[PDB]
Design a protein around this ligand. Sequence first.
Ligand SMILES: CC[C@H]1OC(=O)[C@H](C)[C@@H](O[C@H]2C[C@@](C)(OC)[C@@H](O)[C@H](C)O2)[C@H](C)[C@@H](O[C@@H]2O[C@H](C)C[C@H](N(C)C)[C@H]2O)[C@](C)(O)C[C@@H](C)C(=O)[C@H](C)[C@@H](O)[C@]1(C)O
Ligand SMILES: Nc1nc2c(ncn2[C@@H]2O[C@H](COP(=O)(O)OP(=O)(O)O)[C@@H](O)[C@H]2O)c(=O)[nH]1
Ligand SMILES: [Mg+2]
Length: 299
Amino acid sequence: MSKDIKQVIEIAKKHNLFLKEETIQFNESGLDFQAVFAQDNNGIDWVLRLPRREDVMPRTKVEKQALDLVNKYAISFQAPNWIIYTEELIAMKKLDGVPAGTIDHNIGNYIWEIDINNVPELFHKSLGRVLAELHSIPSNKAAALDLVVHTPEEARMSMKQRMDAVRAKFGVGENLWNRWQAWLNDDDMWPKKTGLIHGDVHAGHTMIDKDANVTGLIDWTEAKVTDVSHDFIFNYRAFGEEGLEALILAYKEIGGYYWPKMKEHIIELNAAYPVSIAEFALVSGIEEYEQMAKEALEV
Ligand SMILES: CC[C@H]1OC(=O)[C@H](C)[C@@H](O[C@H]2C[C@@](C)(OC)[C@@H](O)[C@H](C)O2)[C@H](C)[C@@H](O[C@@H]2O[C@H](C)C[C@H](N(C)C)[C@H]2O)[C@](C)(O)C[C@@H](C)C(=O)[C@H](C)[C@@H](O)[C@]1(C)O
Ligand SMILES: Nc1nc2c(ncn2[C@@H]2O[C@H](COP(=O)(O)OP(=O)(O)O)[C@@H](O)[C@H]2O)c(=O)[nH]1
Ligand SMILES: [Mg+2]
């Protein structure tokens, strides 16, 4: 670790970031980069990304564009701001608060910061406000966005195509497939509006204060303009129908896009969860996700 800590210090120093050596901690990271936490000489907490792959700029372009949008328009939540952004180092000040929960991959569930048997209503109220603000950001006003952008019709067709791709790469259980198709063909259930979404909203990416207000969102790699419903799935899976309704309520009442079958639609999107597991398996290539997909897909 001494080896790595000296390199971190050297790399940071090279970008005029001066760290307290004894605060440097390494996260268990993936195949794109190594996340490092450290405090600087001014007393400010930082998050560093040490790149593990080539072509950092092309691979981060979309995420940076999303961050640029959110930092430009949003006030109800913090998002990362890459003050240092090079092929050798990406660094940003740590957002306030702590993750609402962190995934333990052994048990296949969260280690919660909040009381899962008594979820504070402020979590839903604040996340509702946050998502409402995010999803109303006028991404159309940008001159050269490289984000995926769907009209409502395109969002529906995207799911249709993604599902076919999964029926054909993994094969899909008959019963599961037919529920999906019934969903796709229900014109009235589908949203008639899209917006800029985070795309990976879950407890590990929602920073909360001591009162469980969502004060920030991290990890914007999945940002795009599409069905807003993806940002509600976490609430349903973690908190059940009550948590989903609570989020929809707050969102609707502060001006978020709402339609009569929104809840039903999100529940159907949840039933399509296997599509995402299958895709991450295909992409990452990891057996657990493979089998997880295989089970989820009911093959
Ligand atoms: C409730 C408790 C469960 O959590 C959820 O269901 C939340 C709500 C999922 O998000 C939901 C909701 C949504 C929108 O993601 C936030 C959706 O995309 C995924 C498929 O399911 C999470 C986070 C998924 O992660 C995401 O998987 C994607 C394939 C890639 C994505 N990311 C790296 C790019 C990643 O974060 C995924 C697969 O469940 C993580 C693996 C480890 C699990 O199977 C773990 C054990 C979960 O079952 C869980 C903790 O028990
Ligand atoms: N508390 C806190 N943790 C962070 C912050 N930024 C990153 N992290 C942690 O570092 C981990 C990796 O960051 P992330 O951008 O999600 O990397 P990725 O999961 O590989 O895409 C996250 O799961 C967080 O636990 C932050 O601003 N505050
Ligand atoms: Mg992450």
